[PDB]
Amino acid sequence: THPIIHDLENRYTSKKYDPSKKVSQEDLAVLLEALRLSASSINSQPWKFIVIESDAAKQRMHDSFANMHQFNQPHIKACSHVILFANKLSYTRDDYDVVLSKAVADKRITEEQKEAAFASFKFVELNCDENGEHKAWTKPQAYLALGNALHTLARLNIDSTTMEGIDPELLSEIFADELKGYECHVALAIGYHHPSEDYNASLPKSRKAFEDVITIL
Amino acid sequence: THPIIHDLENRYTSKKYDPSKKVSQEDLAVLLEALRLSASSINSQPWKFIVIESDAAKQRMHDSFANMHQFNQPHIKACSHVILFANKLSYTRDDYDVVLSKAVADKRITEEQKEAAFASFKFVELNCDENGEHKAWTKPQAYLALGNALHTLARLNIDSTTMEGIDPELLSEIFADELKGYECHVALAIGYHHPSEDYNASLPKSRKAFEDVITIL
Numbered sequence: 001t002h003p004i005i006h007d008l009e010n011r012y013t014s015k016k017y018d019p020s021k022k023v024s025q026e027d028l029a030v031l032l033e034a035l036r037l038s039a040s041s042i043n044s045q046p047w048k049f050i051v052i053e054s055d056a057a058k059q060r061m062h063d064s065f066a067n068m069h070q071f072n073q074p075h076i077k078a079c080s081h082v083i084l085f086a087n088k089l090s091y092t093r094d095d096y097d098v099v100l101s102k103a104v105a106d107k108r109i110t111e112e113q114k115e116a117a118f119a120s121f122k123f124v125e126l127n128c129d130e131n132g133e134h135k136a137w138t139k140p141q142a143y144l145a146l147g148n149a150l151h152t153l154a155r156l157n158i159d160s161t162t163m164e165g166i167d168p169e170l171l172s173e174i175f176a177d178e179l180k181g182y183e184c185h186v187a188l189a190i191g192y193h194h195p196s197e198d199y200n201a202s203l204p205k206s207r208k209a210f211e212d213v214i215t216i217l
Numbered sequence: 218t219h220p221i222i223h224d225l226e227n228r229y230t231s232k233k234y235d236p237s238k239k240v241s242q243e244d245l246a247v248l249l250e251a252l253r254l255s256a257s258s259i260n261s262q263p264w265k266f267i268v269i270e271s272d273a274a275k276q277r278m279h280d281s282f283a284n285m286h287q288f289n290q291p292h293i294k295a296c297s298h299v300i301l302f303a304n305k306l307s308y309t310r311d312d313y314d315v316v317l318s319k320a321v322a323d324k325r326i327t328e329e330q331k332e333a334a335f336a337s338f339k340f341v342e343l344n345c346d347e348n349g350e351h352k353a354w355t356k357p358q359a360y361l362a363l364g365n366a367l368h369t370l371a372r373l374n375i376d377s378t379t380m381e382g383i384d385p386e387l388l389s390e391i392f393a394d395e396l397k398g399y400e401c402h403v404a405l406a407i408g409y410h411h412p413s414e415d416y417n418a419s420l421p422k423s424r425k426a427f428e429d430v431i432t433i434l
């Protein structure tokens with residue numbers, strides 16, 4: 001099988017973890033760097049990735065399921081790490097300035113092309129909320145990073161569970177300082193599936209027929 | 218360098234294509250199948266991928282830049298193919314029926330459980346607009362597929378240009394029947410970069426410091 005297809009056919013949504021297997025620090029660093037290298041509109045990188053690693057953090061994450069979506073709760077303590085994909089509520093020129101400043105330092109642009117580069121910012125101004133939030137534009141960038149992460153995990157042979165069945169308001173209450181100026185609509189548990197009880201590990205994958213999703217003109 | 222990091226460090230946004238080089242049909246098939254295998258909430262696959270391949274299609278795509286974002290226009294005819302990432306305006310039971318029916322054909326689920334698998338649908342109405350639309354929930358799924366596509370292209374060593382600088386209104390008029398019931402906010406040109414005029418091919422990549430985007434708890 002072609003290496004790419006094999007990876008994408010063999011990755012799946014784990015439904016039960018093995019609590020005695022953890023992701024190595026070597027593999028965790030590759031995944032975090034892969035997330036950092038993700039592409040985004042105007043290189044805005046309107047995101048933050050919060051890694052829930054310690055037992056104390058796992059407890060706090062475990063507690064965010066007190067009100068809803070408890071079918072996802074068992075995974076928190078059983079899995080290796082949980083990653084929260086946070087997107088910024090509003091993106092300002094000061095936020096973009098952090099990007100352009102780093103670009104000047106990295107030698108992509110000099111101050112000359114810089115002030116001119118600040119113009120790329122109009123593409124942000126164009127996208128917003130009636131109230132003033134760019135979150136309708138930043139959330140999709142975070143999902144792109146997530147798509148990148150899932151492909152990365154398939155290459156590292158690490159199991160995972162994407163979770164939209166989380167409590168955003170409670171997460172912002174529990175991770176108050178960390179999610180300041182951000183929101184979190186999706187999380188990702190990673191680890192190693194349970195050898196016997198993960199029932200999804202042996203169910204065939206199912207997608208719509210090629211002709212139903214792809215059109216060639 | 219670690220294979221995964223090498224791929225993500227070496228992929229970039231092409232700013233000029235070589236008109237004489239096309240993507241082979243063998244590579245195109247791997248990419249399309251990779252897009253089809255993308256994960257989505259409840260396996261909804263609320264998307265459609267439109268491949269602009271023919272000269273006639275390229276002309277139509279070229280014409281959608283008549284009003285805005287003409288900086289992206291030159292790539293249309295110069296690159297190999299353009300892929301439109303379309304997300305469904307509203308998601309219904311009839312839509313889910315298609316997924317569930319294919320699941321039974323794939324043998325993932327037995328005919329008897331189709332009806333009980335519809336239970337996962339409550340998560341969709343939980344994202345129903347006042348207008349009865351779900352596009353705020355479907356658009357992010359499309360971006361996940363896009364993140365998957367970018368990683369896939371880095372593995373195949375094919376150049377690309379993600380484009381949000383497109384005209385969704387004009388695209389809907391030009392690809393009237395193809396985008397019916399969908400919207401398109403992002404497109405992706407693929408091909409081979411121009412050996413001498415693609416200025417971005419030799420500029421270093423720049424991302425925020427690890428500590429600015431990743432927090433470990």
Ligand SMILES: Cc1cc2nc3c(=O)[nH]c(=O)nc-3n(C[C@H](O)[C@H](O)[C@H](O)COP(=O)(O)O)c2cc1C
Nearest residue numbers: 011012013072162163164165205256257258259260
């Ligand atoms: C954005 C998103 C959110 C999802 N949320 C959940 C979740 O809350 N819990 C879980 O069990 N599965 C979740 N999944 C898993 C999907 O059911 C799964 O990706 C889809 O069925 C395709 O199967 P595979 O992932 O096994 O290919 C979600 C997937 C996506 C991409």
Ligand SMILES: Cc1cc2nc3c(=O)[nH]c(=O)nc-3n(C[C@H](O)[C@H](O)[C@H](O)COP(=O)(O)O)c2cc1C
Nearest residue numbers: 039040041042043228229230289379380381382422
């Ligand atoms: C969602 C999205 C839309 C983008 N739109 C454009 C676009 O319209 N035109 C273009 O030249 N670049 C576009 N880009 C490219 C970004 O500028 C680029 O991905 C970012 O600067 C990071 O650089 P790399 O892609 O070279 O790593 C877009 C990127 C993303 C992910």
Ligand SMILES: O=C(O)/C=C/c1ccccc1O
Nearest residue numbers: 041042043123286381382383
């Ligand atoms: O990333 C860039 O160079 C342009 C991005 C962009 C342009 C126009 C409209 C929307 C965009 O994300």
Ligand SMILES: O=C(O)/C=C/c1ccccc1O
Nearest residue numbers: 164165166257258259260340
């Ligand atoms: O994909 C699944 O099995 C559940 C997805 C989900 C659940 C609750 C809320 C939002 C969701 O996408």
